[PDB]
Write a protein that binds this ligand. Structure first.
Ligand code: ATP
Ligand code: ADP
Ligand code: ADP
Lengths: 69, 370, 24, 370, 370
């Protein structure tokens, strides 16, 4: 749960227009593999994808139904 | 890693994946001597590839399988390619995938013929062919833009809006500098500079690159240049001959602005590009006004951007600001665009392997075009 | 008025109340 | 979870959203279902393949704008899947389906089917905690503070009069029609072809709507101004192209009063509202003359209500004081009314719990919708 | 005037002419405006530089042929005037405007400017006593004898469906699309460049039209007949030279139903006609279904109508019987219908006198016409 929380938060930090704008700065400034070597070096896609994979399993769990009760 | 092989309509360029300087910078021209009653000169080649043909240019019949890019005899260029390997990199094509160039409105049989040469002949592990304009915009670093691509054998403005297929406005145009050189040597013939073979053409195309520029008001500049006797500049050629060119320098590229000189039944390059512009959404064409991507090595001309710009500016509204994109390295940006394009992650998967071709035949060229 | 500025699709210079010229 | 509920200011042409208590919705956007129509040539191109928001508000030259809410009435539930799918974006939400209660709105005289299928969506696919969907007229009255009032509300392919006295069950007296600005703008495309403007895209239609809200007004004299010579207001594109208008700007809304101009029998907004008046009572009618709630952005025109005042003055008898109420936010009046209504404690019964619909069905809510 | 009325079959691509008292047009020719692309010094060539008839029908590779009716809309009216003078000339009529009643043709919802400009010619330059110009649909109605129906008049470069029951207009159902066979011929040279055939001239476009009207049809199954192996029929040039065809001959008019190939949105005019059907009355539709009006020479394809019947089966409900109304000489059918209309004596109110033009002109045109 907290994984996905921080994943989306850091994801939005990444998705800020300054970061993406600088990727544009570099690649249009002939530093041609900013988004290439950037997006490929991100596991954020796969991590969020894994939380989406295990999404209904981590959900509706009877944790407090047994521990708290 | 791969083989970034550029196929220049005039000269050539090549190298591996990610190489910066083009290695095979040589004339992509074919040549053979006058195979006659005389014997061989101490043993020598039959066909003369580029610089070899350029060397002994007085007899070697400078030809081209290339018909404004359309290669007729593929045997020529493929032997050139073999020697090009074993000339520049000395690497076999079977270990590294190849990357090639193309121009739109090309008969698919050409590319399929090419393809089967790479597989049946060259046995490349993987292969790919793409448009030169893509590499030009790639070197620019954009995805939205009218890439006016201009080879020295062909011309094709490429309007793009975020890397998307807009072929209805993209139009191939067999406009070669060779055509200008044809007309040029012709008008030279009436100027006392009567010359015939293609060797003459090589010298004068280099002279075209020397002093043939683009003026701003062709008729006014023509009258003033007629009055400007000093503008009729001379140059003692490799042979004892000298030249005289004041009008000719800019008199010759007006054929591009005016098909009338050749009777091409077309429009001038500036409004031709504007016609290609007219085949789109005018509000995204606004971006294209800003995306004035002047590309192709046959745009390395003095006073060409302002000329073209001003022309289409007269055609454009005041708010429609022309914003020229034209680095002087656009000639190399084709091959260098492909060279750095080879280093693309998705492109390392986007391939045409041996069995991929063989098991699909030449049909795979269609979807594996772009 | 401030909310009238906050959103774009809002025009002015027209009274929100339209009534008849109720002849007294 | 029952946190601050999401007040969704729906709409035929403009379906937007915000929250309760707030006076500014953070997600203001219209109805538009577009998607690119080209092939990604150059990699790195911006994608999503279903463009809404800045994508659609940026890449207008590539999308096929679709519309399920034909006359506000949804015809494509798959388009609704995509609409909420974009709505459900966190950059569009910052939440989940359960993080906040939802407050969706409606239009009177609609089938159950709509509520049924939508309940399936937001309580099965999406899993909304609490939600109730009903007419926007009530919310508009909330924003006026009035209770007794004829809500003249118009969508964009919808125009209707809602007579209300303290929100009473009067569906026989309450009227509704589904015809407006979408069709008027389409008729303006007809105007374009008559003028010579060869346009047939939905992106162009957007620009026509920009003119509709921008370079289009009303007059009060139909035939008089028709005989009066116009000026042909030259509109300018984003490109800046001269686009004359003439009297067409107010000629097209005459159809809103003269429905047969498009070939559709009706009686015009005014007479339909008068029919709603007929179903009311003489004493209450005078109140409703004083209680006129004009609403809808489509109602934004020069002397719109003033012309309509003259119309009803020619309709209503003597000594009838007609009074119109029409804020400048004839859109958010519904949004703020939902922002208030959603902010109520009695509202528990007004909303519908998730599990409730999950128990038996939407017919229970159809009992709750009346 | 009490003379024979000039019956002109002014089609966008085929502009024929004749009189009413004649059941066959004697002056038939297509749309063409040629200007000599070559200089002439030595005597032997005739001049005028705007050639109609024989000169244009022989010296195709010499004259820059223009098709001034851009989608049936001409802006180079001057050329058309000269063509009309050519009609007044010895080769066609040897008469005057004042000397005869005249009759031209029209398209629905044309830009008023064109009608005004035409009236300027025929009542200022030319001075026809009584004249009226109308839709080609009425001409077709005379060619069928029918009065009920959806006139599908789809000529050279315009496609339109005209739903009219018993001689009663329904403009909201009446649709018009300014694109047809001319563009399929454009697409045919697009096929030429697909396999490298730079036949860019208008004369070359006529050669393209010769193939279009010589070896082209409609295979009723789209992919089932497209994906097969083609025999590549060797067409014979205006030299008789062999040129293969491919799937091209039948897959070329497919674009008329999927305009996405050219980068356009439409439905296939028959579906627009189905929309008109939907715009009509339920059981009154069935009649129009049986009113399969076939007009415009572009309809000439083998399996054309049957492919459209298949379209009907894919889109229309069961037993709503459709009945093909084919014309024998479709192009003359229009002209003969015009001959019938021009031969109507009652045409008094239907015509427009010259003095009427002198009274209001444009206002009287659009006033008296629809
Ligand atoms: N200084 C110069 N002055 C005039 N023209 C120049 C100059 N430099 C280059 N050119 C033009 O560049 C052309 C060759 O460049 P270009 O890149 O088009 O060759 P190419 O073989 O067509 O390559 P490709 O086929 O890959 O586009 C010549 O025709 C010449 O007109
Ligand atoms: N100035 C204007 N003139 C005409 N139409 C307008 C104007 N402003 C907004 N509109 C239209 O009115 C509609 C908004 O009214 P609303 O009740 O929100 O209707 P909708 O149901 O279409 O969202 C919008 O869809 C918009 O197209
Ligand atoms: N066999 C054919 N195949 C396709 N198109 C044809 C054929 N015969 C004629 N046409 C097209 O139809 C046109 C004639 O139709 P017509 O109604 O006269 O067009 P218009 O009225 O627009 O001149 C010709 O100009 C030609 O382009």
């Amino acid at each position: 749960l907290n994984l996905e929380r921080a994943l989306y938060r850091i994801q939005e930090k990444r998705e800020s227009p300054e970061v993406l704008l600088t990727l544009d700065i570099l690649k249009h400034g002939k530093r041609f593999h900013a988004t290439v070597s950037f997006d490929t070096d991100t596991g954020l896609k796969q991590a969020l994808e894994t939380v989406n994979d295990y999404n209904p399993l981590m959900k509706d769990f009877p944790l407090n139904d047994l521990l708290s009760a | 890693a791969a083989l970034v092989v550029d196929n220049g309509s005039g000269m050539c360029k090549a190298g591996f994946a990610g190489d910066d300087a083009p290695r095979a910078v040589f004339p992509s021209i074919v040549g053979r001597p006058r195979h006659q009653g005389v014997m061989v000169g101490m043993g020598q080649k039959d066909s003369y590839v580029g610089d070899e043909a350029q060397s002994k240019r007085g007899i070697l019949t400078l030809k081209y399988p290339i018909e404004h890019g359309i290669v007729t005899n593929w045997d020529d260029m493929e032997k050139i390619w073999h020697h090009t390997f074993y000339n520049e990199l000395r690497v076999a094509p079977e270990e590294h995938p190849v990357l090639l160039t193309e121009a739109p409105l090309n008969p698919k049989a050409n590319r399929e013929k090419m393809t089967q040469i790479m597989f049946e002949t060259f046995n490349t592990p993987a292969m790919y062919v793409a448009i030169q304009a893509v590499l030009s915009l790639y070197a620019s670093g954009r995805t939205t833009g009218i890439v006016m691509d201009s080879g020295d054998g062909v011309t094709h403005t490429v309007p793009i809006y975020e890397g998307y297929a807009l072929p209805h406005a993209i139009l191939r145009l067999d406009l070669a500098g060779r055509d200008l050189t044809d007309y040029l040597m012709k008008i030279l013939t009436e100027r006392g500079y009567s010359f015939t073979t293609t060797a003459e053409r090589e010298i004068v195309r280099d002279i075209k690159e020397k002093l043939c520029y683009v003026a701003l008001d062709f008729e006014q500049e023509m009258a003033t240049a007629a009055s400007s006797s000093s503008l009729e500049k001379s140059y003692e050629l490799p042979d004892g001959q000298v030249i005289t060119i004041g009008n000719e320098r800019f008199r010759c590229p007006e054929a591009l602005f005016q098909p009338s000189f050749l009777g091409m039944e077309s429009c001038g390059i500036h409004e031709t590009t504007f016609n290609s512009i007219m085949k789109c959404d005018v509000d995204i064409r606004k971006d294209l006004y800003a995306n004035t991507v002047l590309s192709g090595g046959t745009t390395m001309y003095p006073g060409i951007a302002d000329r073209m710009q001003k022309e289409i500016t007269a055609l454009a509204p005041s708010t429609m600001k022309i914003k020229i994109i034209a680095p002087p390295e656009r000639k190399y940006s084709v091959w260098i665009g492909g060279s750095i394009l080879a280093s693309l992650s998705t492109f390392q998967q986007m391939w045409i392997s041996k069995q991929e071709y063989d098991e699909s035949g030449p049909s795979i060229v269609h979807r594996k075009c772009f | 008025d401030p909310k009238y500025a906050d959103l774009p699709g809002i025009a002015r210079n027209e009274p929100d109340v339209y009534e008849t010229s109720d002849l007294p | 979870i029952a946190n601050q509920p999401v007040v969704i200011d729906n709409g035929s042409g403009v379906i937007k959203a915000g929250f309760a208590g707030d006076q500014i919705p953070k997600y203001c956007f219209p109805n538009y279902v577009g998607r690119p129509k080209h092939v990604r040539v150059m990699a790195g191109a911006l994608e999503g393949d279903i463009f809404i928001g800045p994508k659609a508000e940026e890449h207008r030259g590539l999308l096929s704008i679709r519309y399920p809410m034909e006359h506000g009435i949804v015809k494509d539930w798959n388009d609704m899947e995509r609409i909420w799918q974009y709505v459900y974006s966190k950059d569009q939400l910052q939440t989940f389906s359960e993080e906040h209660p939802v407050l969706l709105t409606e239009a009177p005289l609609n089938p159950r089917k709509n509520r049924e299928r939508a309940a399936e969506v937001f309580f099965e696919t999406f899993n909304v905690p609490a939600l109730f969907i009903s007419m926007q007229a009530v919310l508009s009255l909330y924003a006026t503070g009035r209770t007794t009032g004829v809500v003249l509300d118009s969508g964009d392919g919808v125009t209707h009069a809602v007579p209300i006295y303290e929100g009473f069950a009067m569906p026989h007296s309450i009227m509704r029609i589904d015809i407006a600005g979408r069709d008027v703008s389409r008729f303006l495309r007809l105007y374009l072809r008559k003028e010579g403007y060869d346009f047939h895209s939905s992106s162009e239609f957007e620009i026509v709507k920009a003119i509709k809200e921008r370079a289009c007004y009303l007059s009060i004299n139909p035939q008089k101004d028709e005989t009066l010579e116009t000026e042909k207001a030259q509109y300018y594109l984003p490109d800046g192209s001269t686009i004359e208008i003439g009297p067409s700007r107010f000629r097209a809304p005459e159809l809103l009063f003269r429905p047969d101009l498009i070939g559709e029998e009706s009686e015009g907004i005014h007479e339909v509202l008068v029919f709603a008046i007929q179903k009311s009572d003489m004493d209450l009618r005078r109140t409703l003359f004083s209680n006129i709630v004009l609403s809808g952005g489509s109602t934004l025109f020069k002397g719109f209500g003033d012309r309509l005042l003259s119309e009803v003055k020619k309709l209503a008898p003597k000594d009838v004081k007609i009074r119109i109420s029409a804020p400048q936010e004839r859109l958010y009046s519904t949004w703020i009314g939902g922002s208030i209504l959603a902010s109520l404690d009695t509202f528990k019964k007004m909303w519908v719990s998730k599990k409730e619909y999950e128990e038996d069905g939407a017919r229970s809510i159809h009992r709750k919708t009346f």
